[PDB]
Each structure stands twice: as C-alpha cells, then as structure tokens.
Amino acid sequence: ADGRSTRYWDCCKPSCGWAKKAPVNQPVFSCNANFQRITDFDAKSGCEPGGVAYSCADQTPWAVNDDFALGFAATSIAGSNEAGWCCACYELTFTSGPVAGKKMVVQSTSTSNHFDLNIPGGGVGIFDGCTPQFGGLPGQRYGGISSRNECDRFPDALKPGCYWRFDWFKNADNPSFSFRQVQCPAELVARTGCRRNDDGNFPAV
Structure with missing residues (x-):
C-alpha cells in the first residue's frame, strides 16, 4: 500500500494509551510531566485542563544503520480502525526526497493512508x-x-x-512511502509495553 508522511510532537497522551481500544496485553505507556512511566491507564490527558498524562520520551525514533531506522507514529489506514492499528507495526520504504530507498519499522501508538511520525x-x-x-x-x-x-x-x-x-x-519534507504490516520487533514493544494478540499473523523483519 502507498501513503504520505508528516511529522509531529504535541506531548499529548497517545490514543492507544487507553484501555479497551484493541486486543492487546496492555495499552501504550503514558508518562508524567517528568518523563516517568505511570501505571494508571485511566489517567486524564495532559492535553485537557487538569490533566496529568503525557507522551513518554522513549517513544522516539533512532538509527540502526544508515539505511534502517526504528520509531513510532500516529496512523490512519484506509478502511480500518483503531482496533486494527493500535500497537500494530509497519515497514515503510520511502519513495521520495533525500531518503528514497531507506527503510523504517514503526509501531502505531495513536491516531487516507497517512503516518504522522x-x-x-x-x-x-x-x-x-x-x-x-x-x-x-x-x-x-x-x-x-x-x-x-x-x-x-x-x-x-x-x-x-x-x-x-x-x-x-x-x-526530508513529508516524503511518500510504500508500506506493509509486520510483526513488531521486540525493541519497539519494550518501549510501549503494548503487543497485539494477532502479531503471529504477519511476516517478520
């Protein structure tokens, strides 16, 4: 499938950080204002008045080598829903800009085919x-x-x-990509704590 990318960081509690959204072991971790994980998944979002839950700093991208990286995204996938994409992983091959030909595996942590890195x-x-x-x-x-x-x-x-x-x-400015769903690498689940019950149904990277 083909899609377009954008970039963001708003510090808000991620949408896949609430219980009852998807068939997972546990929702995505949220953090307090000092970047420490919290264990109350019902905590009020810091993007609402009086809220205390924010995005964690370890849910950020990194390089494995010059041609391959790992990270996180807010996703919208045509014809699907949060129950289908929350905590799912996708392999991106960029097809425009200075990153054309490079690859990235991301885990969806929040909410046309559009990935907001x-x-x-x-x-x-x-x-x-x-x-x-x-x-x-x-x-x-x-x-x-x-x-x-x-x-x-x-x-x-x-x-x-x-x-x-x-x-x-x-x-790179909003490069395009091709993508496919894959089993999540261990390194991504270690950061969010969230694994889908259907992860055995997809290829590995």
Whole structure:
C-alpha cells in the first residue's frame, strides 16, 4: 500500500494509551510531566485542563544503520480502525526526497493512508500539551523547528529524537512511502509495553 508522511510532537497522551481500544496485553505507556512511566491507564490527558498524562520520551525514533531506522507514529489506514492499528507495526520504504530507498519499522501508538511520525520539534500542531508539561518547545506551532542547532535547547530526554530528523532523515519534507504490516520487533514493544494478540499473523523483519 502507498501513503504520505508528516511529522509531529504535541506531548499529548497517545490514543492507544487507553484501555479497551484493541486486543492487546496492555495499552501504550503514558508518562508524567517528568518523563516517568505511570501505571494508571485511566489517567486524564495532559492535553485537557487538569490533566496529568503525557507522551513518554522513549517513544522516539533512532538509527540502526544508515539505511534502517526504528520509531513510532500516529496512523490512519484506509478502511480500518483503531482496533486494527493500535500497537500494530509497519515497514515503510520511502519513495521520495533525500531518503528514497531507506527503510523504517514503526509501531502505531495513536491516531487516507497517512503516518504522522513522532519527531520532537516536528511541531505541536492543533494541541499543545508541551506548554503545560514543561513550559513549551521551541519552533513554529505548525512546522516546528527549521535547523539542527535548535535541538540544543530541548529537554535532554527529547534531544536524541530531535537530532535524528537532521542526521538519519536528512530533513526530508513529508516524503511518500510504500508500506506493509509486520510483526513488531521486540525493541519497539519494550518501549510501549503494548503487543497485539494477532502479531503471529504477519511476516517478520
């Protein structure tokens, strides 16, 4: 299947972090304002007034080698639903921009075929959970930061994911890709805690 990508980081509790959404062992972990995991999956989202639950900093992308990376996304898949995509994994092959030919495996943690890649500094967009969490992130509300040096001012836990945008991803602007559903790698489930009961039905990478 073919799709288009965008980038974001709004600090909000991810949509697959609520119970009863999908056939999983446990929902995706949320974190408090100090980036520590919390065990109450019913906790109120930090993107609503009085809320306490935010996105965790370890749900960020990294490079395995120059041609392969791992990470997370908010997904919409044509004809499917949250029960089908929450905590599912997908292999992306980029087909445009400076990353053409490179591959990435992502786990869906939140909600046409469109993948919004989790990238600190990609832009908060409609909801700004980062201002209540810790005072806000640098960048334009829509579009985020523009140069690698602006990552230097981010909280230390979010720096690795910020630099990945410039280093491995070559500052690509919304590249297109082809994708397929795959079994989640262990490294991704270790970060979110969320494994689907149907993961034995898909090929491995």
